[PDB]
Each structure stands twice: as C-alpha cells, then as structure tokens.
C-alpha cells in the first residue's frame, strides 16, 4: 500500500484514466499525456487504487468521484499499489 499526495489548485483532470472492473476498483486503465501524473510521475498505467481521496470507487456511478475530484481543492490522497512494472 502506497499513499501518494499531490496538490491540485486548478480545475482540470489529474492526468490518468481508471475504470471499475467486475471486482469494482479504480485502476488506471491508461496514462494520459500532458497530465500531472504522466508529467510529474505519481502513478503508472495499471496501478491499482484501493482508495481515491478516501473513497473506493465501485461498479456504481463514478460521477460521484469524477465530480468530487473536479471540485476538490488541495492535497489529494490516493491509495495505490504497484502491479509490477
């Protein structure tokens, strides 16, 4: 378990794409170019995020996290684990 922390002051996507598999979990399905994660280097495509800002995304609607992440302001704390690079 790794606790990454990155501050976000601007209203824009972090810089990664994740989905909820049949098991229901947010994992970066693919890293986007230009994002803060791809530029700064906080996560990697495939990394498993057990928790997103204190909330574990499930098969349900993600709009809850998508909005919260877009409306969030400050240091974001995500629980991710390296799936062997």
């Amino acid at each position: 378990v790794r606790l990454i922390q990155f501050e976000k002051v601007t209203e824009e996507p972090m810089g990664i794409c994740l989905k909820l598999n049949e098991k229901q979990s947010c994992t970066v399905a693919r890293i986007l170019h230009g994002g803060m994660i791809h530029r700064q280097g906080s996560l990697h495509v495939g990394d498993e995020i057990l928790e997103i800002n204190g909330t574990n995304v499930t098969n349900h609607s993600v709009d809850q996290l998508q909005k919260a992440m877009k409306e969030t302001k400050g240091m974001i704390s995500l629980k991710v684990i390296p799936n062997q690079q």
Binding site: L18, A29, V62, L65
Partner: peptide
C-alpha cells in the same frame, strides 16, 4: 467495459 479520466 468503461473508463474514466480524472
């Protein structure tokens, strides 16, 4: 399958 960019 779906994918979210955030």
């Amino acid at each position: 399958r779906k994918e979210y960019c955030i």
